[PDB]
Design a protein around this ligand. Structure first.
Ligand SMILES: *[C@H](*)c1c(COP(=O)(O)O)cnc(C)c1O
Ligand SMILES: *[C@H](*)c1c(COP(=O)(O)O)cnc(C)c1O
Ligand SMILES: *[C@H](*)c1c(COP(=O)(O)O)cnc(C)c1O
Ligand SMILES: *[C@H](*)c1c(COP(=O)(O)O)cnc(C)c1O
Lengths: 438, 438, 438, 438
């Protein structure tokens, strides 16, 4: 049970035991809380099966996996408008996910800032990072790398880091600013452009030059296709690096993330380690070492098969569903929407709360429980900062969640409302927050 | 081939294109350089295929995957003699590999050390780490977390960190010592026991109490089965944590690593982050967030199917082949062996060099090249520290590399020698280090 | 939107669309309400796949499928102690399920009765059928064939047809008595032996000769293996026919039923239809005509693979889990058990209710809902007969639901109780019967 | 050796034994006697495999299977011009085949009649059913439900139920008329419109109001696509119900039938039974209960993939081949055709007999045997009624039977004729009817 087994067991019996237990896991098709891919593609399955033993770090034994990874780095860099590479190869790396990507970005950000302060003869004893309602990976970064996290707290009417409060927290100890292009909590984009203008003025008034790292975990694979006019990437001079989750809207299977740097200068060479290989040593900047290359290969398949044309069609379908749900749900209760699935505002999500004062006879926690009985997982949870007095419901519309599935959700939603009305004693009982990806 | 594709392509054409390219990767069956699993098991393939979308961090949607992970943690802790958990669950976590596991162990060391010094009213801005010929992940750890790496260099006579030099580098700023229970370069174990005795005396003399973290990337899944008497794990009081690679001798597919802590006190809770889940929040101490659970499930399959009984047989087979090759190769040239595949000395590997002042007409680099033309990748490389000019050949004997495969290698080895003798001009031409996992 | 589609679409697109929505169906591994097979066997999947086009009624084109069906009929007849047939072939047939099998048995009863009456110059326009708490297929039989259904009502302290009330309902117009060897509602066996004794005495006293048809939908593939001493089958003279569901404890996949007659005399030939075939016409007594032979083939696979000893082990495991749950659940509340998974009393099920006048702060309907939120479907429903006031919870233990899953259920059971205790306003809200197979 | 096996057997041995004997079944590709699907589609195989455990009656655990079934009901009703449903859902149900469907239609018909007679103060103990050369399922219906079958006999000139002889058999005890829209014996359609006009006149002259149930086992999925203007469905007032076989020209795998009622009024609610489900009770009118939902899912796949335009193409291909064979075979002997594969007269079949008084030196029975030696099963059999002295050959052209298969059949046909000519003693030897689906 708790001990390492003493004796053997027939291969097929062991497989039989485990296979039967796994049916206890959900298939997530009715899970509207997660951001990760849950759609099945036969080709992706075959590519992953073929790559179970392909070692991502062994560029000697698996040269083509390595080659494909480099093409991916170039493509993502291009998608984000990185300046043309002098050597023809963009500066970036594949990672397990946005978490590792963000940490690599954070470290580079801290290193640049440090070397800069040292060149000015200033102490590098107490660095700080300015950001909004960031995902937990940034809290780990601040803690693990001894950096003071200056999180602009959420607050009624302004659930994001705005220019004014951002500047209020910036000083010579700020290694950089991290806008979240697709806030986990709500689905809305923190727009880098306005923040960028503020940083320019800041330099003009104080001489302090601050860089940006965009945590585009979700938005990095959305805006480029459905809202190209939004300027949030390398088109902005201060953006030295950007990270995103391939396994979210990048459409790759779980285990794929990306981080790109503006140019060679943006990435401190002190953070790159050379590794010997027969064809010459190659530098790597990663937290991991041995790991499978299947997700990189699957990511490439998605790029090759879809292109901008196909990604636009896929993301457009998600936004269409999200907008549909936002419009229909609005008609069923006294709700105040925070996100409505608009391409120009954020990701394909619907986030709302009960209007202040309004009491329809149930909280969102109660509604979430009723829906769970219908098989749906629609997360309800309290926000942070100075808005912890707010309870919201967030619906994520991923690939595979078609219009007809949304129609069914609406029927169950209405059925859940009718039930809550018929049984008033239910109101107020549900009090636990669901998994919200952070 | 550099920019993100503009137009889409037929799914099957995209697959066909990538599939054809992948034949350029090797299958590693004749690669005797890598430590990672290269053997195919139909059941492992099925479990992995079933888990492509199972999110390791989403304990809510995939509860059984989470349950299986916890069983593995307990089993590994048991295998390493961890003290009985007061709450029934061992303290530890699954990782992508030994690199992440080592970083988590390192940070824990750094944190325990901190609170130790602060308590004793002493500064904490100049920490250092004492170790031997460690794998690159530790060099990354030192650089990324600003810790002074005090690596005891290899030298003709002792290519490992010995008790004497270890104490010489130890002081009040030593956050801990890291013995490598299975040195990447040679395959030999750095025995923790002697170093442990030295650490107790160091405390009895200076009052300084230094702990250890065992990097058992390879050895953690070897000694427990074929050399139980070697005391290197939690049986030693100073060992507060141990890490190992499941995808190496743990026999799991690429993407699995483990780190276990002696008990709750060994892991600073300041490094643990809580995440909300409908069934209550759960603490996680990891660098990654979203990622697939298939490797954990496959690891469990190996534990269940093999048990101590099955692992002993698998590892015994490897040691058998290693010892055989060591015995037969010694008869082919003037060699000095560093590792001969002995269960009591290290892992299933053969490592040797030409005897000092002995020129047989070829270097090990030349031999490696002849073998490469015969399909084998047997790495030749220079050591580090004060042995920088020593060239060695290291042969890894993994699951799948059976006796008849070793017999073929010997025939190719002898043929390579005859060719080198018949063509003296080849001597000294090859000079590049092969991939050596570090 | 729901009209017959106008245009064609790509084969793989249509499949993709349907495949994706099928995830909305459950996998039933945590459904403890159904009696049907939910376990998966690769060999069964292969046999079914190979038989997709094998026509059960076309004995000419698919002679081996026909041969296999006949072997199954002989094996089932043998299992139920049917008298040895003169021509070497038992009288009986495969069906889609117990429903069709019961109707065939019902028609035969009605026919034997009619002929009996006609021979004695008695009217045949007012036939009735005596039974206990039968599954809905008998209510369908009564209505479709105009037979007065005399169902002995369940009542506190006697939820089954007892000898006394059975006789009270019998007369000259009774076509037969249907004991239910495994009552759907509770899982308990209605023992034929005592009822048979009553029918013998009834004949001796009134001259009325009444026969039985045993509805052994579940019990037919249980008692023969774990309680062979229970005399419920053909060993009893009045039992003219027996039916059972191969897809329940017969372990066959959905779509397999069986009905066996005592001998040629038990099956009126007026009900058999001869169909022309090259090798000679063959009689058929069935409601269906064209249909696949896959389930018959799979049933045969189960017979050959397991045999008596195999089935005994499979059923024994289910009885263990059931007895275990009954034993453990009793310790968690003021319950009165109706069925506790004892082999000598019924099927592997647990059925209970709250003790009269006892109020633990919840109804079983509330507990069922809490368990649903934890992924389990454990049906709670009101009884039939004259007990539509009593609410019970029934747990079915099928193949695949092993001990460890039962342990998990207990953990969730206890967790549900605690939640109900900490939230008393939940009491009495839930009030809808779950699917209970009738 | 016919008993229930005693010991277990290795799963692989049991599978091997059975797999090897199944090769004794034919693959039916050269069987031109059957109406059922014998074509293989990988997507249908995948869908069926995924649905092995999906319980058609458990709408609670398998809600999507249930929802898909309802879509199919609506689509088939639309295809047959059923009046728009007030509640949005057509009245009808999936069945295992046309046999069950016909019995359901038959019972409903008997009930509607009974209600009418009771209100009229007339006896209801002598019901009769008027029909033509119906398939065996109606003979079963008549026997099982005690209804007098008034079958208009086949006779030279008219091998079907004509208006005049239909009316001559109709009286106040007639529960209805059953036209066969695709006669099993000949492939010819019995046109409902002419019969309908006759029933209109019958009511005008006698006040006796008689309805119809169309047995469109084969024609129900043909005429709507290739002969839209044939008025045989709900477009006709007296048509209260229609049934058809999905596994015949509906292109679904074995185990799928359909029966649709004109409206709620056409279906006596006393024949519907309610079943409890967590989401509310749902009524069912079926003979069977538990069974797999795979065929329903596969039928939906065919509807979605093909649509009206696709079915038209598939059906046209079969008719093209039928017409081709009819035209060619006529040039090979003194034959009188009954069916020539015309879309406006019937299904894709070829039916013929030897001209009266003509003796080419062989009977169709002899020709059939010769073709069997060449791998073809082309049934030859005697008709009934007043044509008991007429022997015909019927060739069915199903999906998969391409033009080149037909060309091969013709070569073998010619070869068989030559052989018969060279061996005159063969004439008259063969005298057994083949399987003809009835
Ligand atoms: C999901 C998310 C992350 C974490 O990315 P992973 O791929 O899960 O490691 C980081 N930031 C934001 C804003 C996210 O939504
Ligand atoms: C292989 C190795 C590592 C790195 O482990 P990964 O599983 O590749 O991350 C670390 N330390 C040693 C001693 C190793 O051999
Ligand atoms: C399940 C059941 C039936 C119906 O059997 P099916 O195989 O679903 O047709 C009939 N009687 C009893 C007692 C049952 O439990
Ligand atoms: C084939 C046929 C039937 C029987 O249909 P099944 O799907 O085999 O139950 C009934 N009537 C006619 C006219 C048929 O051709």
């Amino acid at each position: 049970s708790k001990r390492f087994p003493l004796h053997e067991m027939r291969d097929d019996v062991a497989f039989q035991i485990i296979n039967d237990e796994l049916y206890l896991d959900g298939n997530a098709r009715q899970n509207l809380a997660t951001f990760c891919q849950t759609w099945d593609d036969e080709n992706v399955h075959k590519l992953m099966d073929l790559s179970i033993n392909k070692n991502w770090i062994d560029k000697e034994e698996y040269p083509q996996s390595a080659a494909i990874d480099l093409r991916c780095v170039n493509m993502v860099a291009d998608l984000w408008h990185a300046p043309a590479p002098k050597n023809g190869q963009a500066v970036g790396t594949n990672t397990i996910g946005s978490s590792e990507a963000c940490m690599l970005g954070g470290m580079a950000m801290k290193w640049r800032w440090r070397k800069r302060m040292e060149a000015a003869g200033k102490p590098t004893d107490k660095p700080n990072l300015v950001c909004g309602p960031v995902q937990i990976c940034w809290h780990k970064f601040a803690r693990y790398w001894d950096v003071e996290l200056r999180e602009i707290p959420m607050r009624p009417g302004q659930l994001f880091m705005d220019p004014k409060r951002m500047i209020e927290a910036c000083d010579e100890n700020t290694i950089g600013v991290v806008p979240t292009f697709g806030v986990t909590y709500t689905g809305n984009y923190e727009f880098p452009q306005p923040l960028h203008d503020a940083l320019d003025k800041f330099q003009a008034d104080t001489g302090i030059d601050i860089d940006m790292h965009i945590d585009a975990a979700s938005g990095g694979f959305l805006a480029p296709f459905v809202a190209p006019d939004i300027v949030w990437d390398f088109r902005l001079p201060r953006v030295k690096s950007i990270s995103a989750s391939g396994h979210k809207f990048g459409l790759a299977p779980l285990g794929c993330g990306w981080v790109i740097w503006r140019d060679e200068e943006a990435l401190p060479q002190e953070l790159v380690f050379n590794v010997d290989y027969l064809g010459g040593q190659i530098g790597t900047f990663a937290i991991n070492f041995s790991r499978p290359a299947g997700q990189v290969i699957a990511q490439y398949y998605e790029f090759l098969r879809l292109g901008r044309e196909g990604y636009t069609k896929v993301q457009n379908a998600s936004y269409q569903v999200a907008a549909y749900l936002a419009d229909e749900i609005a008609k069923l209760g006294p709700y105040e929407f925070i996100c409505t699935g608009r391409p120009d505002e954020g990701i394909p999500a619907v986030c709302f709360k009960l209007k202040d004062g309004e009491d329809p006879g149930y909280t969102l926690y109660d509604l979430s429980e009723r829906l769970r009985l219908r098989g749906w997982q629609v997360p309800a949870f309290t926000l942070g900062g100075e808005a912890t007095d707010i309870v919201v419901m967030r619906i994520m519309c991923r690939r595979g969640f078609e219009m007809d599935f949304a129609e069914l959700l609406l029927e169950d939603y209405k059925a859940s409302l009718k039930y809550l009305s018929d049984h008033p004693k239910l109101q107020g009982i549900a009090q636990q927050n669901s998994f919200k990806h952070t």
